[PDB]
């Protein structure tokens with residue numbers, strides 16, 4: 001119902017087939033719940049070799065994205081989007097993406113994602129063309145395409161019809177009942193939905209505490225969560 | 238020279254064309270510096286509909302990856318890799334990936350990346366088949382393929398011949414000298430390499446301090462870095 005439009009600026013638009021042609025996101029595109037539209041800076045060049053990079057002022061080992069083709073591609077995308085479109089640049093210098101951030105971005109009906117290549121883009125373009133800068137993680141990649149697709153996949157899950165709480169997920173079990181000597185926890189076989197809910201919640205609480213203690217600090221646990229966590233920490237001791 | 242082999246278990250192997258056919262990583266594959274080999278659990282099914290999912294014990298809204306096809310695919314990949322291969326599962330419950338973690342993973346000559354779909358995989362498979370669990374970020378995606386590709390792209394940068402310090406990157410500038418009233422910092426035009434190096438370092442220090450203060454805590458700054466940062470904080474005031 002509340003479909004989403006995402007414009008993409010990229011030198012390798014065919015990379016985005018990975019999300020538009022496969023799985024849940026592929027279905028979302030086919031069903032017109034999500035639309036991904038790509039513009040290639042190479043198409044906006046004029047020199048006879050279609051040059052899309054340029055030398056950095058001050059010297060340096062690498063190259064930067066050439067301003068004019070990239071600038072023109074962005075302007076074209078903005079015009080196609082109309083008013084309301086938020087322009088986002090993916091880079092390690094951006095705001096750290098988390099699920100809260102995903103929910104925020106997902107409120108936007110229109111996004112334009114600029115995918116950097118080489119050593120990046122001109123700083124003045126960030127000032128004049130980019131509304132927000134985001135990062136998917138503290139690591140370095142060869143291009144902004146994978147971060148853009150990661151963002152798209154993340155926000156797509158919030159679009160109505162695409163699918164079917166601060167804690168890590170509980171463990172999951174399926175057939176067979178015994179796998180290499182390891183049995184399914186009896187509570188999951190019991191058929192008692194309330195016990196199953198509490199066990200799963202307790203497991204999530206235990207796993208978050210053991211693996212990601214800092215995530216617990218940012219939460220105000222319910223009475224039930226405080227109790228189950230206490231139980232888990234007592235059993236762990 | 239120190240090429241890398243990465244095995245992938247995925248229901249959508251064609252997604253990985255995004256990294257194997259394009260850009261820096263595409264070149265790495267063509268030049269045999271990086272090899273990405275995929276196995277599809279669907280190929281290991283036997284039922285007439287090639288079923289790759291299964292119902293979770295204890296009930297629940299979603300489905301899990303079916304154990305037998307996934308187990309068989311993993312075993313096949315391991316056999317193809319031989320000894321030394323580290324098997325990695327991508328999920329939000331994994332160890333948080335950062336650049337330090339990328340450098341660690343990049344030491345491995347062989348990796349096998351298991352890409353979960355649906356609600357995930359059986360916990361006992363994690364215990365019996367998975368060596369390490371990693372996460373690219375605190376957000377939820379539809380599948381492990383994008384995280385796997387993100388990891389591959391990240392570690393590929395450390396392979397010799399693929400390409401050409403705790404701080405955020407400095408701003409970059411290219412042509413033209415004036416862009417919508419915004420000029421290139423004169424120091425980058427000066428031709429004085431030492432001044433340019435110090436300005437870039439100071440900019441990185443300033444940006445890290447303003448955007449990601451916590452990253453500074455984890456660093457032991459050099460005498461020069463302490464001074465340039467002090468200068469930046471004085472100028473900011």
Ligand SMILES: Nc1nonc1C(=O)NCC1CCCCC1
Nearest residue numbers: 090091116120135136141143147
């Ligand atoms: N990490 C990240 N989070 O979002 N993007 C990231 C990245 O590593 N992007 C690669 C590009 C970014 C532009 C400069 C060239 C490298």
Ligand SMILES: Nc1nonc1C(=O)NCC1CCCCC1
Nearest residue numbers: 327328353357372373378380384
């Ligand atoms: N975040 C992440 N970091 O690594 N993987 C992530 C993820 O969100 N993976 C999606 C899959 C994970 C298996 C269960 C179904 C969802």
